[PDB]
Design a protein around this ligand. Structure first.
Ligand SMILES: *[C@@H]1O[C@H](CO)[C@@H](O)[C@H](O)[C@H]1NC(C)=O
Ligand SMILES: *[C@@H]1O[C@H](CO)[C@@H](O)[C@H](O)[C@H]1NC(C)=O
Ligand SMILES: *[C@@H]1O[C@H](CO)[C@@H](O)[C@H](O)[C@H]1NC(C)=O
Ligand SMILES: *[C@@H]1O[C@H](CO)[C@@H](O)[C@H](O)[C@H]1NC(C)=O
Ligand SMILES: *[C@@H]1O[C@H](CO)[C@@H](O)[C@H](O)[C@H]1NC(C)=O
Ligand SMILES: *[C@@H]1O[C@H](CO)[C@@H](O)[C@H](O)[C@H]1NC(C)=O
Ligand SMILES: *[C@@H]1O[C@H](CO)[C@@H](O)[C@H](O)[C@H]1NC(C)=O
Ligand SMILES: *[C@@H]1O[C@H](CO)[C@@H](O)[C@H](O)[C@H]1NC(C)=O
Ligand SMILES: *[C@@H]1O[C@H](CO)[C@@H](O)[C@H](O)[C@H]1NC(C)=O
Lengths: 352, 70, 352, 352, 70, 70
C-alpha cells in the first residue's frame, strides 16, 4: 500500500487539473459569449443600419432615374412659369414628334418636308402647362403646320443712291428692303430681316410679320421706273454714308466726308472704294470700313476646343475569410474531444 | 445661292431660298405621372426618399399656381 | 488481490492522458477563437466603418442637393442665361412670396386681385436679374409688372383687301387700322401687331412699349369708314391680292381673278366655293379656307393625347437576423455542463 | 484498507464522468463557435460585400454626375431649347474661354476692354447652336457679338401730343422722331422702338437689325422742329390726346379737354393737380402721374428684402470599436490555465 | 365675345375683351445662402461632398462674372 | 445724365449715353466628350450607373435629331 497513499494524492491532483481546466473553459465561454453578442447585437445591427441607408439612397437615385422626363418637365415649366419657348426633347420625344407630324392635315410630301425640318418645328412651336392634379402634370404642345414649302423666296437689301448737281443732293432709297416669299395668288413680304430665319437654303417666316403684296412688286427688281407698281422708295436731300450687309456680300454708300475702304483681318486696307454705290462680295474682302468703324463681311472663325471629363472608377474591394487554417484546427478539436472521451470510457471500463 | 446687284437702285436681290410658311396649328396633349414609391420605414426619421417626394410634391404644388386651367 | 490497485493505476493514467487531450483541444479552440475575434474586430469592423463612411458621404451629398434646392436652382437658371431670366420662375420667387409682394403693390384692391388671379402672367411679364455673387451668397432682384389699368373695353380689328373691277381695271382699298385697341383715360391705345398683345380668357395683356395713343374718334372708322370726322388710315392699290386673314371668331377671305377659294371641313374636303370678292366666314361655318392648293386652318387641330406613368420605385432593404435564441441555448448548455463538471469533481474529492 | 481502494475506485468512476460531462460541454462550445464562424465568414461578409457593391454603384453614379457636370448641363440646355440657346450660357463657354475669345477679336484695345467689362451682354446678345452629336461627343458652336463701335454720343427722344385750342376746336402736332438715336461715323442710326436698345450703365446695346440710318441733320429737329434743313416727321391731328410719356429721368403729361391729370405720391395720394396743357416732370418732383384713375409710376417702386438660408448639412458617421481589453484578458487567462492544468497532470502522473 | 363683319371695309371687329395694362415695376430683392456643411473627415482622399462643394464654389465664381453690379 | 425738356415739341431729349454697336460675329467650336467609366460587374440586377449611362445615351440619341447638320 506504499502505492495507495500516492495513488490518492494523484487522483486528487487530477481532480484539481480538471477543476482548473474547467475554470479556463468557463472563462473561454464567457469570452465567446461577449463576441457572440457583439456580433449578434452590435455588429449585425450596424450592417443592417448601413443596409437601410444604402436602400434609402438606391431608392432616391432610382426615383430620379425612373421619373426623369417628369422631373424635367417640372423644371422647364417652373423655369418659364407655364410656357416653354420651344418644344423640348422632354416635352415631346422625337418618336412622338414624328408621329404627330405624321398625322397633320397635309400631303404626304409636305409631311416628308416637315419631317426634314423637325428642329424648326420644335422651335417655332411651344408647350403649355395646363394643370397639376395630384401627382400628374398635364400640358399641351403646339406644333406648326407647314402647308407651304419649297416656293421661290428672296431677300432685298439697299443703300442710299445719292446723285449731286451743284452743291445739292438728290437721294433715292428703296424702302422695299426685307424678305419676299412667294405664295398662291400673292407674295408675302416680311419687312424686317429679323422676321425670317435661315436654316440652309430654307427660310422660316413668322406668319404674323407677313403682309400680302401684289406679285407685280417683283417688277422693281428689273426696272425701278416701272409704271405697273408703286415702288416704295423715299427721297432725301442729304447724303448718308452707310454699310448694308447681304448674305453673299455688302452694299456701301460712300458720300461727302467719309473714308470707305475694303480690308482684310490679318493685313490691313487693300482697296479704297469710290464715292457712290459699291457692291462687294464675301470673297472680295473681309471687312468694309466707314471712317473708323470696321464691318465684318463674314463670320470670323475662332478657336476650336476639345474637353473630356475625368474618368470614373469602381471602388469595389470585397473581403473574404482565410477559412482553411481555422476550419482544420476546429475539426482537430472535435477529434481531441472524441479521443479523450473514448479514452475515459476505456479507463472507466478498465475497472472490472 | 445667287446674289445680284442692281446698280439702278443701289440694291441687291439674293434668290434661291426655299419657303417654310406656317399655315395652321396642330396640338398634342401629354399627361405625365410620377411612379409609385414604396414607404421606406426603416430609417430613423428623415428618410432621403421621403424627402425627395416632399420636395417634388411641393414643386408640383407650386407649379400648379401657373396651370392654364386656373 | 492488490493487482486490482495496479489496474486502477493504469486506468487513472489513461484518464489523465484523456484530460490532457481534451485540454490541448480546448487550447486549439481558444487560439481559433482568438483569430475569429481579431478577424471580426479588425478586418470586419474596419470594412463596415469604411462603408459607414462612404454611406455618410453620399448621404451628405444628396442631403446637400436637397437642403439647397432653391439656391442651386436659382444659380442654374442664371448660368443658363448669363444673369437675366425670361420670366419670374418658381425658384426665383415662391408663390407665397409672389402673393405677398403683389398684395403690397401700390394700386387699388381690384387690380391687386386681378394680378393675384393671373400670377402666371405676373411671372412671365416680369423677370429676374442677377445682382452679384458675394462669397457663398447669391444676390438677385425680381421685377414684377404692376397692372394698374384693368377692365377697360378692348377689341381687335382684322382686315383684308377690298378690290373693285371695271373691265380689267382694279381699285383696291385696304384698312391700315389693323391691330388691338384698348380704351383708356383720355385716349385709346392701339397696338399695331397681334403679337403685341397676349390673350388670356377675356383679358388682353399688352406690351406697354408697343402701344400707340390715338384719338378716341378713330373708333368711328368702325361705323362709317368714309367718315369725315377722323383721318381713317386706308391704303389704295392697283392690283388684286387674294389672301386669308384670320379673326378670333372666324376668317376673312379675298378671292380675285384666277384663284379657287373654298371653305372646307375635316373628313370631307370642301363644302363651299367662295364668291370672287370679300367673304367673311365663322369658326363654326367651316374649318378650313383654301386658296388654290394651299389649305389654311381656322382653328387648332387636335392631335394625339398621351398618358405616361413612370416605372415603380421599389425597396431593396432585406435585413439580416441573428438566430440568437438557439445559440444562447447552446451557451446555457455549456455553462451548465461546466458547473456540473466542477460539482462532480467536488463529490469525487469528497468520496476519498 | 481494501475498502479505501474501493472508495478510490468509486471516486475515479465519478471523476471520469465529470471529465466526460465537461467534454460534451466543450464539444457544444465548439458547435457554437463553428456556427458562429460560419455565420460571420459566410452570411455576414456576403451582406457586407453586397453593400460594398451598392456603395460602389452609388458612388459611381454621383461621381459620374460630378466629373461630367458640364457635359450633362450642355445637353440639358440644348434639349430644353431644341438645338439653339437664347444665351451663351456659363456651361457653353467659361469665363476664361469667353475672355480669350474676346481678346482675340478683330477690333481695337478699348473695344476689347469694353466687351470684357460687359461680358454679360456679350453672352446674352450671342447664342449657341448645336452642330452635332456623334457617339458620346457633343459638337456645338458658340456665336459671340463683335462690338466694334463704342463710346460714341447717343441719346433718346420722347414726346407727347401738343394740342392747341381756338374757339373750342383743336389742332395737335406730335413728333414721330421718338426712339433711340446713336451717332455713327458719317451717319446717325435711329432705332424707332424703345425695346430695341438695352441700357447697362451709361452704355446702350442696340439691336443691329432695328437700326435705320438717318441724315445727321435730324439733330436739327431738336432745336427748331420746323427747320427747313430737314423734313421732320411730325403728325397733325384734330382731336385731343391726353397721355403720359415716360422719360428716363421723368415724364411728359398732355392734359386736354375733360381729364384731371394730377401728380401723386405712393403713400399719400394725389398731391397736386397739373395744368391743362403740356407739363414735364422729374423723378424727384413726384413719384406718380395720374390721368383720371390711371396711375403711372415714374420710377421703379422698390419693395421688400429677403434673406434665406439653407438647412445645415451634418454628418452621420458613427464608427465602431470592440472593447478588446476585457476579451483579450479572458483568452490569455484560459491559455495559462491550460498550461497549469496540463503541468498538474504531469505531476499527477509523476508521483506514480 | 362679339365679332362683327364690317362689309363696307372688308374688315372685322371683335369686342368683349378687358384690358390688363402694365403701369409700373415693383421689385423685390433676394439673398440666398448655402447651408453650412460639416467637414467630412472620414474619407480616404476625395470626398463626394467636398468635391460637390468646390463644384458649387466654381459655379458661383463663374456666376459672379455675369452679375448686374460691376 | 442729362435730360432736357423741349417745350416747342412737347418732347424730351436725353443725352449722355454711350454707344455699343455690333459689327460682326466671332465663333468658337467645342467638342465635349463623356469621361470613361469602368464597368461594375457585381451588378446582381441592373446597375445604377449603367442606368445613368443608358439614360444619357438615350438623351444624346434624342439630341442628335436637333443637331445643325441635316
Ligand atoms: C454595443 O451595443 C450596446 C447596445 O446595443 C451598447 O450599450 C454598447 O455601448 C455598444 N458597444 C459598442 C462598443 O458599440
Ligand atoms: C424702264 O427703263 C427704260 C429706260 O432704259 C424706260 O423706258 C423707263 O424708265 C422704264 N420703263 C417704263 C415702262 O417706265
Ligand atoms: C409611412 O409609414 C409611417 C409610419 O409607419 C406613416 O406615418 C406614414 O404616413 C407612411 N407614409 C405613407 C406614404 O404610407
Ligand atoms: C486583415 O487585416 C490586417 C490588419 O489588421 C492585415 O494585415 C491583413 O493583411 C488583412 N487581410 C487579410 C488577413 O486577409
Ligand atoms: C357715311 O359718311 C359720309 C360722310 O359723313 C356720308 O356722305 C355718307 O352718307 C355716310 N353714310 C351713311 C349711311 O350715313
Ligand atoms: C444564410 O442564412 C440563411 C438562414 O439565416 C440560410 O438559409 C442560408 O443558407 C445562409 N447562407 C447563404 C449563403 O444564404
Ligand atoms: C424757326 O423757323 C422759323 C421759320 O420761318 C423762323 O422764322 C424762326 O425764327 C425759327 N426759330 C428759331 C428760334 O430759330
Ligand atoms: C476640412 O478638413 C481638412 C483636414 O485637413 C482641412 O485641411 C480643411 O481645411 C477643412 N475644410 C474646412 C472648410 O474647414
Ligand atoms: C461592361 O463594360 C465593358 C467595357 O468596359 C463593355 O465592353 C461590356 O459590354 C459591358 N458589359 C455589358 C454591356 O454587359
Amino acid at each position: 500500500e506504499s502505492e495507495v497513499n500516492a495513488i490518492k494524492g494523484a487522483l486528487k491532483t487530477t481532480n484539481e487539473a480538471v477543476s482548473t481546466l474547467g475554470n479556463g473553459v468557463r472563462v473561454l465561454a464567457t469570452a465567446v459569449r461577449e463576441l457572440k453578442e457583439f456580433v449578434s447585437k452590435n455588429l449585425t445591427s450596424a450592417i443592417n443600419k448601413n443596409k437601410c441607408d444604402i436602400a434609402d439612397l438606391k431608392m432616391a437615385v432610382s426615383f430620379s432615374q425612373f421619373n426623369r422626363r417628369f422631373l424635367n418637365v417640372v423644371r422647364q415649366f417652373s423655369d418659364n412659369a407655364g410656357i416653354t419657348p420651344a418644344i423640348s426633347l422632354d416635352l415631346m420625344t422625337d418618336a412622338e414628334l414624328a408621329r404627330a407630324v405624321s398625322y397633320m392635315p397635309t400631303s404626304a410630301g409636305q409631311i416628308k418636308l416637315m419631317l426634314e425640318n423637325r428642329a424648326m418645328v420644335r422651335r417655332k412651336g411651344f408647350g403649355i402647362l395646363i394643370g397639376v392634379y395630384g401627382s400628374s402634370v398635364i400640358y399641351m404642345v403646339q406644333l406648326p403646320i407647314f402647308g407651304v414649302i419649297d416656293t421661290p423666296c428672296w431677300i432685298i437689301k439697299a443703300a442710299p443712291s445719292c446723285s449731286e448737281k451743284d452743291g445739292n443732293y438728290a437721294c433715292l432709297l428703296r424702302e422695299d428692303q426685307g424678305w419676299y416669299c412667294k405664295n398662291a395668288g400673292s407674295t408675302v413680304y416680311y419687312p424686317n430681316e429679323k422676321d425670317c430665319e435661315t436654316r440652309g437654303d430654307h427660310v422660316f417666316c413668322d406668319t404674323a410679320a407677313g403682309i400680302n403684296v401684289a406679285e407685280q412688286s417683283r417688277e422693281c427688281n428689273i426696272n425701278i421706273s416701272t409704271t405697273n407698281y408703286p415702288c416704295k422708295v423715299s427721297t432725301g436731300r442729304h447724303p448718308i454714308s452707310m454699310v448694308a450687309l447681304s448674305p453673299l456680300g455688302a452694299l456701301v454708300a460712300c458720300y461727302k466726308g467719309v473714308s470707305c475702304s475694303i480690308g482684310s483681318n490679318r493685313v490691313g486696307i487693300i482697296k479704297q472704294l469710290p464715292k457712290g454705290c459699291s457692291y462687294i462680295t464675301n470673297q472680295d474682302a473681309d471687312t468694309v470700313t466707314i471712317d473708323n468703324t470696321v464691318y465684318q463681311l463674314s463670320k470670323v472663325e475662332g478657336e476650336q476646343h476639345v474637353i473630356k471629363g475625368r474618368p470614373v472608377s469602381s471602388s469595389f474591394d470585397p473581403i473574404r475569410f482565410p477559412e482553411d487554417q481555422f476550419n482544420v484546427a476546429l475539426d482537430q478539436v472535435f477529434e481531441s474531444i472524441e479521443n479523450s472521451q473514448a479514452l475515459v470510457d476505456q479507463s472507466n471500463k478498465i475497472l472490472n | 445661292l445667287k446674289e445680284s446687284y442692281l446698280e439702278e437702285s443701289c440694291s441687291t436681290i439674293t434668290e434661291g431660298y426655299l419657303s417654310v410658311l406656317r399655315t395652321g396649328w396642330y396640338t398634342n396633349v401629354f399627361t405625365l405621372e410620377v411612379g409609385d414609391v414604396e414607404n421606406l420605414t426603416c430609417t430613423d426619421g428623415p428618410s432621403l426618399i421621403k424627402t425627395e417626394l416632399d420636395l417634388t410634391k411641393s414643386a408640383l404644388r407650386e407649379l400648379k399656381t401657373v396651370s392654364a386651367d386656373q
